[PDB]
């Protein structure tokens, strides 16, 4: 394939931070710093991935070029991400809107940390991938700039509090799916 | 006088920034960049400040050495401060554990900001002077450092929001002082 081992190996990384990879193509490129590629080559190399762990897991690892990649990792990550895949708008102009639906504990960031920023964290982790905390700051859009990664490193949320805080809340969306879906009695 | 025109200048600007500044040279002498000299000049230079003031309003203005001293801008600023210098304890163990006693508004600062950090300022403006909040920030026991000033010029407080509170706290000062004078008969 058009690609280096290095560039295999960083695309994986970025692939295991997505839901529903083979359609976040793009951010995927943007996150492993491939923004060069053709979307073409982007759509080969997730597609390996894709088939390879669905040939290994139909533990067990598969080869690209040099690089061995261990198929049970790919799919632990892409599990823990389906709540959020489930729960998110696709769509651009609802995403931007989307509230977290149900009640959030306090933060405990020893700041104002409120639905909006718990819906802005999600939206961003969508976006940019989980764990990808600097871009997240980073978006013009998303307002969390001025509240995420203080330049004090004793001020919170640092990235062990995001990490905390988002597998909280992706918890939250997993049991209110559940929720959702016995009340309506639609699988 | 054994100071030049220059530092005289700094020990006024530092002199205004206390209440009782005579019992305070050394706090004076470490803001205005003066630790070098002796407390008899200090004590010198703060009486000339001292009497001249008095002489001057018994605007009026008077001089040390070539410098031109506004007696009433130093007086105005003194009279801010009479809340704070008859609140603040002037025993150091006292004045650690300081409370302000009555309820206070909330700062919105974004931030939890309560009771011990608007206590923690007001000992702060004792210690270092109305309007030295960097040295309020690096003090290692007031628990503002990683509080006040945030190196992010957009999140709060900055030195605007710390003036604004610091007025707001003396006029509460001011207000629970008339208060238990009245409520107490004893003038």
Redesign the interface.
């Known amino acids: 394939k058009g690609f280096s081992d290095a560039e295999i190996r960083r695309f994986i990384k970025s692939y295991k931070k997505f839901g529903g990879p083979l359609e976040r193509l793009d951010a995927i490129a943007r996150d492993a710093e491939l923004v060069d590629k053709s979307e073409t080559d982007l759509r080969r190399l997730g597609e390996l991935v894709h088939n390879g762990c669905i040939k290994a897991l139909k533990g067990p690892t598969f080869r690209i070029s040099g690089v061995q990649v261990n198929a049970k990792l790919v799919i632990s990550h892409e599990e823990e991400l389906i709540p959020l895949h489930k729960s998110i708008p696709s769509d651009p102009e609802e995403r931007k809107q989307y509230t977290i639906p149900c009640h959030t504990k306090a933060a405990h960031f020893?700041?104002?940390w409120g639905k909006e920023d718990d819906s802005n964290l999600l939206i961003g982790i969508y976006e940019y991938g989980y764990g990808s905390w600097e871009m997240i700051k980073m978006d013009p859009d998303l307002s969390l700039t001025?509240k995420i990664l203080?330049?004090?490193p004793?001020?919170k949320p640092q990235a062990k509090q995001l990490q905390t805080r988002a597998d909280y809340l992706i918890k939250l969306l997993s049991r209110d799916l559940a929720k959702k879906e016995a009340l309506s009695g639609a699988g």
Do not use: E, L, M, R
Request: proline share 11%; charged share 65%.
């Open positions: 020893d700041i104002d001025h203080p330049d004090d004793d001020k």
